[PDB]
Amino acid sequence: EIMVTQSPVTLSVSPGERATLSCRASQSVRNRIAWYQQKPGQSPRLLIYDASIRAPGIPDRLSGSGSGTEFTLTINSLEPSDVAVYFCQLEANWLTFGGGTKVEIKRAVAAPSVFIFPPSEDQVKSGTVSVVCLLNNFYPREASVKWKVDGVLKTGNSQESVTEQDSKDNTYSLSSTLTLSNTDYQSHNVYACEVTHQGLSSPVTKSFNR
Amino acid sequence: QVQLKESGPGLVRPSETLSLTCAVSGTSINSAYAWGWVRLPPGKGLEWIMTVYTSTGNTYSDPSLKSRVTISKDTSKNQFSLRLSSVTVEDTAVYFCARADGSDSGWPHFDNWGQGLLVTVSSASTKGPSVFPLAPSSESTAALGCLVKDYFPEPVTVSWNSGSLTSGVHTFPAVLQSSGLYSLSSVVTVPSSSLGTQTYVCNVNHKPSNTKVDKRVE
Numbered sequence: 001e002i003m004v005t006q007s008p009v010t011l012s013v014s015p016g017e018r019a020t021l022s023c024r025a026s027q028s029v030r031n032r033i034a035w036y037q038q039k040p041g042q043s044p045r046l047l048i049y050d051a052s053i054r055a056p057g058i059p060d061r062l063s064g065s066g067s068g069t070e071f072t073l074t075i076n077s078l079e080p081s082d083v084a085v086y087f088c089q090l091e092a093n094w095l096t097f098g099g100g101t102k103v104e105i106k107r108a109v110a111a112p113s114v115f116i117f118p119p120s121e122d123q124v125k126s127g128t129v130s131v132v133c134l135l136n137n138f139y140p141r142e143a144s145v146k147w148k149v150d151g152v153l154k155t156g157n158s159q160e161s162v163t164e165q166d167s168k169d170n171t172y173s174l175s176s177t178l179t180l181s182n183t184d185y186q187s188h189n190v191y192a193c194e195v196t197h198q199g200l201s202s203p204v205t206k207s208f209n210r
Numbered sequence: 211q212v213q214l215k216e217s218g219p220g221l222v223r224p225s226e227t228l229s230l231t232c233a234v235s236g237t238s239i240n241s242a243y244a245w246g247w248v249r250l251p252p253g254k255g256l257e258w259i260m261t262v263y264t265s266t267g268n269t270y271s272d273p274s275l276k277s278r279v280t281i282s283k284d285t286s287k288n289q290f291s292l293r294l295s296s297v298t299v300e301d302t303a304v305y306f307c308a309r310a311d312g313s314d315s316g317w318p319h320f321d322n323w324g325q326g327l328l329v330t331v332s333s334a335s336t337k338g339p340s341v342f343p344l345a346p347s348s349e350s351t352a353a354l355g356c357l358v359k360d361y362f363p364e365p366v367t368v369s370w371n372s373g374s375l376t377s378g379v380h381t382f383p384a385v386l387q388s389s390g391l392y393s394l395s396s397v398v399t400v401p402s403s404s405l406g407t408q409t410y411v412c413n414v415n416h417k418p419s420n421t422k423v424d425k426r427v428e
Contacts, residue, residue, distance in 0.1 A: 034319040036256070043306060043323040044256065050313055055321065087256050091317035093270045095246070095258035113399075115353040117344040132344055134353055134397050136380070161382040161394065173380045175395045177357075179387070208347045 006098035014106040019075040023088035032091035039084040111199030112138035116206040129185045133193035135174035144196035145176045212236040214324030228294040232307035244310035249303035330363040338419035343427040355397035356412035367415040368396040
């Protein structure tokens, strides 16, 4: 019985600096560790095998090291192409991977652009309407979205989704969808979306009538 | 110099047998050291399933699912298949097949992975999505989008202007609504001065339901 634990869960590194990922095996396994890179929507790509051997095509910036129980994957001069999830794998007949480490680049604080979309007219015929609030291009990963219908807070009736870190400007986008019934949508007037973010001195509210 | 391609059903009813085939191209399957299956559950990393060794045919599988999994190999088709039985909803994941390499040590590691195939385990039926346009209320940048509501199962493809528009596009990952159906958004930021001189359509494609719809957004 051998476990491999990765740390940290998320790693934030400035552009050009060094990223150091840790992989701890519960028992001494010499050099039997393999590192993999996996970007969202893509297959895993082999980076290191046997603790310190680079796979063909892997640049010198990435290099694995360590023997025994603790192992490290180092990414020198971090590039926007390095934002991914990295897995370490115990090289055994009963294989086992680590939980994975997400790596993102550090960026200047970017305020989000808040858009709100009233539901189309063909939605009300279906009996369910969905109003969408968009938070576009902000670097501080987490924000606070609040839905208010005629001043009444209605956040627990919505669902959120965040895209990956953009490869060009290194920001995040968030989209919240408040789903209500048509018979409830026609019984209220103002629908507001309140956004709290580090790049905002005060909460930004976007609303509409009808 | 080796390409792997997973094949099989994208939706499987519970308690049934999931059968996934890994077609290998480039080399002979028996020219490889070993082959393996690894899946990616939602909210989880890579979890190894099985591994078959070429020279002997011996199989190693995860103990938490030993009696439920087998692997067959067809050298004529140059492929090997994974069979998971008594499939529960816990088995919904993105299943990969990969080639193993023992190096000098003989301990396995994967060097070539397949595209990956998403398999959803549910008794729900296949359902096509409803596509509604997303436009701001009736200022140097406008946000246009499409809402792809109530479809099952994953995934769906959304492009803008038949792939001609890529900059400023953000297709959000889908959200599993409490109804058992998915819904995602796909937005794009464009100059406000171009809204009158530029058409923006979203190309939604849901292969499980054989649905294809292009929506003009204004």
